[PDB]
Amino acid sequence: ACYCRIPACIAGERRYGTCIYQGRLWAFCC
């Protein structure tokens, strides 16, 4: 399962779609 976009190990994969929730997008983090 993928989490949201947070200043973390965002590398590896980059999600194109963005999640609008409280102003926080979801990057591909695993």
- Residue 10 tokens read as 């965002």
**C-alpha distances in Å from residue 17, one per residue of 7, 21, 24, 27:** 17, 13, 12, 8
Work out the number of other CB atoms within 10 angstroms of the CB of residue 6.
12
The ranges assigned to domains in the chain are 1-30
- Tokens coding 20: 């609008």
Q: Is 5 exposed, middle or buried (0-12, 13-18, 19+ CB in 10 A)?
A: middle
Cα(24)–Cα(22) distance, integer angstroms: 6
